[PDB]
Design a protein around this ligand. Structure first.
Ligand SMILES: NC(=O)Nc1cn(-c2cccc3ccccc23)nc1C(N)=O
Ligand SMILES: NC(=O)Nc1cn(-c2cccc3ccccc23)nc1C(N)=O
Length: 263
């Protein structure tokens, strides 16, 4: 799963990510690619390479394909399928006011299809959010970065008590005990649905991390976005049930969301 540096060419910079630069490039005899350079010390590289044999086999039309790793010299880089329209969060904000309700539900269905595949594969995403979803040809949405937080070395991001912890997308058992499951991914998915129907608004903007924990623990939930129907908002609330056992599985959500789309 190792890509030799002689098999990669960098064409143009497309931006800056959490761990370094992202470039548009080519992979010899394969395809056009997105290459993410990873700063030394940002991830547990040895742990990551160890799991490639099993994880690289994961493949689905609604998942961004990781093609391989270039590790001859530091900084290392990850080579991915190129997604023409970039991150979902930015795409929603740039096109705000131009979306039909059916297009927004369709985006949620694509994410749900990818997540149902990961659920069946017994793979936990751990940080599902619009910022981790990509937009491809003909507005297809694909999920990316599943399981990556298991390798991140910044304690301020990974610890539930950390200053940069993504509390806004965390279920109560995640913010309390780092208890991850496909059911904690369902909670995150409900928040992702709110980001989609609000056209890229940031959840709980008027609250600090501790205020979010206190509000959620006392039963408060995000308000219904204007573009979300009462049936769609009911599904969002099912993702936000306090007990993980009471939340629907992704296989169940996929059937329920598909029924809403058709009718
Ligand atoms: N056209 C694009 O902007 N594509 C892409 C943008 N990205 C990015 C994903 C996550 C964070 C990023 C930060 C900065 C620039 C690109 C990023 N990945 C792709 C991809 N895999 O094609
Ligand atoms: N867009 C992505 O993040 N894709 C992917 C990420 N991963 C991985 C997730 C977690 C740990 C991994 C360890 C090694 C190689 C791939 C991994 N596998 C894929 C894949 N098979 O496409």
């Amino acid at each position: 799963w190792v890509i030799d540096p002689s098999e990669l060419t960098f064409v143009q910079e497309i931006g800056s990510g959490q761990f370094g630069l992202v470039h548009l490039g080519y992979w010899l005899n394969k395809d056009k690619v997105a290459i993410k350079t990873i700063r030394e010390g940002a991830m547990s590289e040895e742990d990551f390479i160890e799991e490639a044999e099993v994880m690289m086999k994961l493949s689905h039309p609604k998942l961004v394909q990781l093609y391989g790793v270039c590790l001859e010299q530091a900084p290392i880089c990850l080579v991915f399928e190129f997604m023409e329209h970039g991150c979902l969060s930015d795409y929603l904000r740039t096109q705000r006011g131009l979306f039909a309700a059916e297009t927004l539900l369709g985006m949620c269905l694509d994410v749900c299809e990818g997540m149902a595949y990961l659920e069946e594969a017994c793979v936990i995403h751990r940080d599902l959010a619009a910022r981790n979803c990509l937009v491809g040809e003909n507005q297809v949405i694909k999920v990316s970065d599943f399981g990556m937080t298991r390798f991140v070395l910044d304690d301020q991001y990974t610890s539930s008590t950390g200053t940069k912890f993504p509390v806004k997308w965390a279920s109560p058992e995640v913010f309390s005990f780092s208890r991850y499951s496909s059911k904690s991914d369902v909670w995150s998915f409900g928040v992702l649905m709110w980001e989609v129907f609000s056209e890229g608004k940031i959840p709980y903007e008027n609250r600090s991390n501790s205020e979010v924990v206190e509000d959620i623990s006392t039963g408060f939930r995000l308000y219904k976005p204007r573009l979300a129907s009462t049936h769609v908002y009911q599904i969002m609330n099912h993702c936000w049930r306090e007990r993980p056992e009471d939340r629907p599985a992704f296989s169940r959500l996929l059937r329920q969301l598909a029924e809403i789309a058709e009718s």
